[PDB]
Amino acid sequence: SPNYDKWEMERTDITMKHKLGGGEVYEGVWKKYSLTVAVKTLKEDTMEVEEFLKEAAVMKEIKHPNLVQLLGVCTREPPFYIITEFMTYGNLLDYLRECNRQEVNAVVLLYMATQISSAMEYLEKKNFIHRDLAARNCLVGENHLVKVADFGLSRLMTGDTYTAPAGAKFPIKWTAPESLAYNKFSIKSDVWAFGVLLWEIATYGMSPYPGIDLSQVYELLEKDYRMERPEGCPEKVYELMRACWQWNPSDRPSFAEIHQAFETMFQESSI
């Protein structure tokens, strides 16, 4: 619902406020509604105009209450912007670390998982993969509202397996075996990650496979090693992480079954 065009924003309707991230992301104020928005910027000189813009295209397609909302883009002249709704509390990982473990009880936690599991069931149906699911890419709002964000590596998808361009580098501890080894991502890659994103949340923000090196993860997943149940974590929810960490992507639950597990306070099928 932007200014003078469907998604085209005049560089004028936005009033930049200040850097927030490193390829630069600022906080601004969108005049027509005096709404505070986030503005992702492109490094003026790097053959990205094509790549960068693909992100703002995956977004125009999806619209869910737990997926950060695209509000517009600037393309006709540089620098190229991508404007979205602002999320006052920033990324979930950080929030979790700093947060107060009293105001954030084990139910607020459950609440966050459910919010995310919901955005994935939706994404699952629209048939989209979020090639980089993890706390550092979830944002937070008022009263622990959580929204999934960062659709850089996000792909729509025809067949049910995407082969990532060879010679790449990805977040080892969140990446699934069949991807770390064959550069093939699927809506089952996300399920694997989601399994990590629950471990992150449960441990109030720790780093996955703690103390273990990146080079040792895969060979360790092959020997059947998996992380142990976080403290204070309900055996019901751990049980669900394992599901997400099945060596065979075919034996992993779906987001639809996963969301059901949560939304139902556990009165549904991954066993």
Partner: peptide, 8 residues
């Protein structure tokens, strides 16, 4: 620590 990295 370091997040990203390639597999071999």
């Amino acid at each position: 620590e370091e997040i990203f990295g390639e597999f071999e």
